[PDB]
Amino acid sequence: MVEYRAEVGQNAYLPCFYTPAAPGNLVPVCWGKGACPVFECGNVVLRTDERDVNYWTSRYWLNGDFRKGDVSLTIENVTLADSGIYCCRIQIPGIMNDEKFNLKLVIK
Ligand SMILES: [Ca+2]
């Protein structure tokens, strides 16, 4: 687990990257609130798949290019309620092999 900081009223940046084969040949990724569970993400805030961003909402979005493996999460206009641990999960095809990144956001 690695810790990151943001300020109230600004945007949070939570880095998360992998190296894909090609822009149209990606690995599905999920983000969730809470430490990464055994499988999948809990409390999902964003999802991508082999070609598209399939799930996002007004305050949870990507500022970088997911087709290049930049799956870093932006949380827009944060409040103290956004403090906590987030999971970035790189859902490599196969069993028991995802990359599970735990990110703690501290907000002041
Ligand atoms: Ca897997």
Residue numbers in the entry: 1 to 108
The authors write:
To do so, we performed the first NMR analysis of a TIM family member and solved a high resolution (1.7 Å). crystal structure of hTIM-3 IgV domain. The latter includes disulfide bonds that connect residues Cys38 of the B-C loop and Cys110 of the F strand which provides an anchoring role to stabilize the front and back faces of the hTIM-3 β-sheets and noncanonical disulfide bonds between Cys52 and Cys63, and Cys58 and Cys109. Notably, the B-C loop of mTIM-3 possesses three proline residues (Pro 37, Pro43 and Pro50) whereas hTIM-3 has an additional proline residue at position 45 (Pro37, Pro42, Pro45 and Pro50). Together, these differences in hTIM-3 result in no apparent outward bending of the C″-D loop in contrast to what is observed in the mTIM-3 structure.
Previous structural and biochemical studies have shown that mouse (m)TIM-32 and mTIM-419 bind phosphatidylserine (PtdSer) at the GFCC′ face of the IgV domain in a calcium (Ca++) dependent manner. The IgV-like domain of hTIM-3 has also been demonstrated to bind other ligands such as carcinoembryonic antigen cell adhesion molecule 1 (CEACAM1), high mobility group protein B1 (HMGB1)20 and galectin-91,9,18.
